[model samples]
Target: ADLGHQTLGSNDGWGAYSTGTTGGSKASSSNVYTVSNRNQLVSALGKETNTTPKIIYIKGTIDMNVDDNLKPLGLNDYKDPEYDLDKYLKAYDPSTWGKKEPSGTQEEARARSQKNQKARVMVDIPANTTIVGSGTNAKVVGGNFQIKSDNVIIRNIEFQDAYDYFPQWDPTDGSSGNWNSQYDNITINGGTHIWIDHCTFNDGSRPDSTSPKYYGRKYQHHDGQTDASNGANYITMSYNYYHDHDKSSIFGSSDSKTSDDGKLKITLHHNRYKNIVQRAPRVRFGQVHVYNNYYEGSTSSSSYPFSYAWGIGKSSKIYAQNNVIDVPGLSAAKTISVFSGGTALYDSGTLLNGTQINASAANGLSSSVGWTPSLHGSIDASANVKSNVINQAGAGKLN
Candidate 1:
């Protein structure tokens, strides 16, 4: 009850002049469904713009790497028949292909192949819905969900190893060439009144460490785990476990995207972040509440090293309290950053390497985040947060 479908605390944050979140409470029994596979899961979600209330229970693993006929889909399944990777690589190799971005028939064919995969894998959830995993191992593998609706609750599910097959190599991306790929585990685009609780998200078998390098850099196959942007408002994410990924999350769309002036009200509490490189999460224009979560930065010998947790952006207000961070080489002063000219943040009672840190004094930070949070449960002490996160966070941990 505290995590989902509860009364809004003080009617602030996600509850600013709004009712509390209650997903699928009004659902009729006919609208309730149980699914165990991709087709059944896809059908249970209804149409993309649907708003009818539904309660969906998922059991066992639902794999999305399949064709319309439900046949297993490999990387060659989506590859353009005329397109050859060796040919594409040789043509776009920076040494011979020059500093220009790739063009010609192969690039066009590559784009079309990517779109074909995108059309199949992106699943959109409707408004007034509850999608919960039924048992200990209920998981969704190789699927990307698009939360483009309002009043949705998702709980106790594991989203695992969703990757893109036709990642593009752009030589003009940075000083050196880089790989740009598509697909996030969960993309909250234009969603409101969302509650995502007790879920587990991991790179699983397809982490960046396992990726092969092309044009010097590792082939970037995956993207952010949970990214909310483009007018996504009133989202409270609690008790979720995220691990082994790069660029964990994003709140706003872009630095120049002024549409995010007063949106993205996200409250993150009691979550577990293990081996994340950075952006757990990077905020833009939003009033964000981050409290009592556990952050484990990248390990010492990982391909991705540790970086900052909170990325303060343009006109953002972030309040962080009582969180515990255990990282190999990270300093408390390095956690908060003004990536896009953000000025005001409040940090207190947070621990780094088991030692309490004063980010304001250490990082020269301003100690105000515009307002106090009035939309969450009571905060746990910093000393006890680490144990609670490891013991109680993630899927199947709730009783």
Candidate 2:
């Protein structure tokens, strides 16, 4: 039942809780927890608490980077263990990651990196939990929020600057070299039935454009803003703002794999993408419904400009309807990009200004994918989407 509040929208999928889900309701408010600091937030999400539906009320910014209790030992914290970089580099070269030969030293280094990541204070949102902010400007900083369980809700919060100070030197990552950080503002990994509404995610002091390069590659200190990876299902990302970042959101990591073929079902509606690079949700193998969102790719930063709007790769079945995309003069970016072919995209009502473009015509492409999406929410005209989203989306007046 809605409890007579009608807080959620009637048009949403999962009923009543669609606005901002009701988590941790063990029949009453007895299970509710309030937190103002990072330590209390971690404790509330800890395993010691009972796994009933819970409501976590957060008041202000909870910076996870400076929590001395949750802090991890950095590279400077470790003594020189006589670890030879040349020995590890010879076996696992960075240029040939995922296709290179294996070595024991490389494995050891990987394990070390994993341990360091675990050492950091990453808070895991338990199953059946609702994390809601107090007001319009509640914030989460210097830490990452990881969701692996199911039936969760997070709304009305600003997540920023949750950087990974200790990035793993994975010699086997990119074409030449790569330093991979280990966090996002929020990561939904192997979770189901999630509703993320009216939240803001960004890099605090370290935008990716300003990050220094190492070994000829940009030392990526941050990951996705809200990434859904490893078979996360039944997700709805609505009314959120993602900006000032690169590699924004990834649906499926690999395009060659069939494991995520029928899974990763998601819906993106009325969200805003501002000053972001690529992957305004680059998809792989999923039935993704993207509609009524706004994209503004205007940035003064020379290091990166507005890239592609939407990426459809592998066997992704994407339905793009009534979305508005605004970029600075027609650069290399397209409205819809198909990678590796075999992508089934039906672009109907999309708008692009100044040398305005439409969806790709039938240029001998394939729209052959299984399982069409059945959820068709409200769709505004492409001309009206920008104004509608600007007035309705993001973390303010949730009407």
Candidate 3:
């Protein structure tokens, strides 16, 4: 009972502390910085010098608050009594309508001013640090934690309701338009050799349906749960739980070919994705390996009858193997959705019960440009993947 065993992903630069990971942050049983509030947490994280590795123990809950004084689009309040949507639309519109061409300069000035005041609520984590939560109850609310450097570990933390009240309206998105929100529960912006294990991410109080309708669409208030972008490479996410969110886990920033190719190498294994809408991750040019995970989809809480479990887009080479998809009443044909740029993927040993089916078996995945994966941990049979992941994935008893 006293003996501990090596877990999967333990080899190949996995686990909380890996070899050649810079910084002196590893802690013993008696040494650690304890935090229970936002300020203390932020301050401690700010103190990390990267010279010495340190362990930050989180206890209780940290309630993060946005800077209400700083609002987006230069609006004093989102729902102010004097604010008129139609009037603002007309005034802010850059296009010429009817018989008059609008003065574009004023509109551009307003847009620039609005962009300057957008509130950014995020906790900046330093390199070579281990941030561990007390248990399942150790939570982080209303803000995001960004990992920008290399060699960091975050485990056993429940990231709850990191909502963005000010979602920027981008007219250039499409004909129907779109809103872009900043911040995620965790953003590995440009880090290397990072590990995120045994954590849980969820929308706390605000769901997508609860968002206010602007321009005939529900304004999305949340972004990715965990996003790796901007040349971030060599990362591992294992035994985590992600639920009740839209736009989950974006691998690259965009379809720009030169930006992401040969970078964004990530590994997601033994995780649990429950009731998440899409982008289980939507990839772009990264070589991503997703294996031995559990996915449970739900149409009950979503606006669409069904959503894509995985997005294969823009030269992304995904090796999806030994996973379980238990999407009830979903057609196998509709399970995996493809974008125009197409994807390079290899699917094997995928199991689906009920109406769900595998994308590769159904010929739903295209034979586009794909990547051959050269890295992975130990792999189990497709038959054993579901039970092994379900029994041991997510927070509580970390392996």
Candidate 4:
């Protein structure tokens, strides 16, 4: 396991590469810093620098050191006892963010000025890139992580809100959009052969404690309609744990009809999603393949849908198989909503343990010429699902 370099710290505030001290009292007192997302580092991975596609992994739990408690008066929906709006603004510049936002003109500007800043760590991955965090608990803060290329892999990392950045927007509202702004743990664009496996995504959206106990009311500060329109083809999202995220709506608003190939082959599998309020893996359009995943502590209150209802409308074809669903107390709105095109296969699991997604198209995709490619990590189908046949069905059948 390789951990990247120790970058900036918190004292540097929320500037691109600022430095700072650790406010939280951890067992090991390693000094910390603040980073303005992985823009330059991602660029290094792309063309100029000495980045190798051969497993660029992070070593330790690099702390983003953001406190959600720092948000302002009215916008303090997250109920942070240690709220400090001033300290947050000093780091994440409101002016830069406000200008970048497609909506919220004058009044929004004024509100943002008093809001807490969100820590951001977005990276634009080059082709054949693999980023592994040093430790599973390690973290990067940012508004969103935007990935541009293919054949990229991310493992064992956490993304969260910067104590200094603050703005309150609900994801389900659909009004708070980010056209000029793109936010996601991993956003895939024009490429082939990608895998996002074995990692954890912390609560990147707003953290409002006063909100509901198990609902994703706070993370919904932003809608998926903004501009997360990067086509991710022949991709596999599997074997990871996701928790406490509100704004991450899995896929974007483009009804797979946007592009002829928009609804190409994309798969989501064998994931454990906990405490998620918004759509877990919202599939807007495409040939979607969903299978073999687990869910825990999820909200079914229209706030979150593991697979969105609209996917069936725009998807060229939708397939799901071998999934375990467990929601001790969630409404129908929060569970997987399937329309006519989607198919679900049978597997034995509970809403508590995890779920499996079985569909007809998934079997077809597995039979096609899809190769796991890199053997750097475990590609065993059993590791993510009960059946390997689902993954292998389409491997040799493609033209």
Candidate 5:
């Protein structure tokens, strides 16, 4: 129980890598990291750890808002709440306990929640151990806090809400400008050598979007954690599947006022992204390495979809190569590329309908004239355009 020493491989629900002493004991051993509930988990987190590396596994998904009231605070549901929300609001509203919800809009809900929300499991992670989820089934939901441990790794886990979608999900859901949005799925504030890989994020559905949160409300709905300024460095998001996160932004530099930057050495590779509706990936001021992935395809084909759709700036030092895409042809056809300094890259991909898109003669901009490119940057012949996974990978290899 002392921070001086640690126990490992127990089935109970506390210790390093496991709950109990052995995989056999039920009290002390943990088959996976599902604490005996929120209270017990928080108590265990209060315990200290040595400088040694420790691995903590979460066996099941955790929903921060367990009361079903949609508030991240005190409710009669959980026998114990790490830090009661109702109590905190009382401190802020001195005259009133300021209940979770039933009346106010999403903003009021978030404000009240932030004033009342407490940690489910807040701990100082030891070094060198990896916390791996059993699979996609493992997760930690709700609440708000910062991860401040280095050499820490969280993999194969999922984070979600039972109430509302993230801000990045719907551009028209609320303010067009970035306001009250979650910072990160796994926020590692002021830490080094951190890694979050193979994980997925789902911002739950808001069945009652009409009852919008007023400006003076406690907190907003599209809130959780998405941005990572404040030193969330050396991060790599790879081989992960991201979908249905409509309101949440993929990446950003926290807020305009925050001096800290997002991932210093970020790597987004080999991932599959589909159904991403609102909020395009934005990088305020940092190096973002985006390569080797699938982005549900870009609407760059549309007349000027980005001008109306993209909210972030185009000044990123983008090394966007080695990625595959299936461009959709709608009102018009165009292939546009702009450099960091706003210079357009010479566009010369083949067009559909048996037409040649030669940028050498055109203004070097993409071809708006419709035919698909028969001769891609490196496609040898028409055989590379087949409809098979193996063929697609082969086509990339030819480049």
Candidate 6:
């Protein structure tokens, strides 16, 4: 009931604060519809209604793996019959196939399989659209949101796992081989002037630990939980809960994606991240500001307990302020990972484990990052940040 024509003020994050983002503010009452199932939701997001100013109210859980009749669909429904994972792996195995990009009939079949799954999943969101939940229970299960249009507001919903059946194995990736998936829960591709608040993002039923192994590495079904890429700029993510996942969020897709340069401007504030492996909103070719957030989680004492939290990729300028992190066994020196051609940015009033890490030297920040965030609300003190974010962040917590 509190949803309508929400504007991102200067008190909000860096996003559309100056751009005056007012999604669906002019939507007629006829364009406002409440959807409770998959078909109804998809119809509401149809191309005819997508770009027009409209408000979509999600009333309950919408399962994207179901048919228009709401019948549950199995893996067989999306997988290509000609594509066998076992055969594909054998054909593209690095030991035998070397470090070449995937090809041949098996690879062709895998592409078709991924395409099928993408068609079944990816729910397209349009410009000037406000998709909010009727209540805290509005949840999206087993689908990815393709936010390609600009001026969108998504709030107060739970974004659950949307799997990709076929994940290509790129042997030359990383130190060894890497499994590349095709799906992300929310892909902000080429969209701008967006605000995502009071939502929950996680791997719902299937977690990374349960993923099957190929080349002794986990086969990932998901790419990014909430990724902003393909020149997405002027965005704010506030009061959200991210957890139970690996590579939880990323700013830009790749260095080769030169379109992302001078774009990907984003603000993240008053959020909580728990039990995520790495990249608590990693940055690449963006001017990102992270402030007034709480991050607290841990992995086992097992080998490699934690990876770096803030990933700094090429041409990134991150200004982090007033965040509380309480993950033991992870060092402040290791808190930030600077990738090749990237430099870590400035941080103030931050904590790692039990120690305050406000200075750049503590986290190995590079002096080359020369930019200040002009768009943001008042930052909470480090001591108060933990309490404020824990109490106010995530779905159903908004006034």
lDDT of each: 0.82, 0.69, 0.68, 0.40, 0.38, 0.81
Highest lDDT against the true fold, candidate: 1
Model 2 ranges off by over 4 Å:
1-22, 25-27, 48-50, 68-114, 171-174, 331-333, 354-356, 362-364, 367-372
Q: Summarize candidate 2's per-residue lDDT along 301-341 as a digit string, tens digits.
A: 57446777778778877777788888766443356566885
Q: Return the candidate ranking by TM-score, descending.
A: 6, 1, 2, 3, 4, 5
- Which tens-of-lDDT digit does each residue in 211-299 have in candidate 4? 33112223223332111245645555555666655434445355444663443455665665555554555555555555555554534
Q: Which whole-number lDDT from 0 to 100 does residue 27 have in model 3?
A: 45
Order candidates by lDDT, high to low.
Answer: 1, 6, 2, 3, 4, 5
lDDT of the structure predicted as candidate 4: 0.40
Q: Compared with the true structure, what per-residue lDDT tens digits does model 5 show for residues 197-275?
A: 4556555443223334333342344442333455545554544554444433334444442344323334444444444
lDDT of 3: 0.68
Name the candidate that leads on TM-score: 6
308: Cα error in model 1, Å: 2.4
| C-alpha TM-scores of all predictions | 0.93, 0.84, 0.82, 0.54, 0.54, 0.95
Lowest-sum lDDT 10-residue window in model 4: 13-22
Judging by lDDT, tell me the better candidate of 3 and 5.
3
Poorest stretch of ten by lDDT in candidate 1: 3-12
Angstrom error of the Cα, residue 273, model 4: value is 1.2
Global CA lDDT computed for model 2: 0.69
TM-score of 6: 0.95
Q: Against the hidden true structure, what lDDT does model 6 obtain?
A: 0.81
Write the residue-wise lDDT of candidate 3 on 51-127 in tens digits. 34567778888776634332222245323343344555566443523223323544344344334332335766777
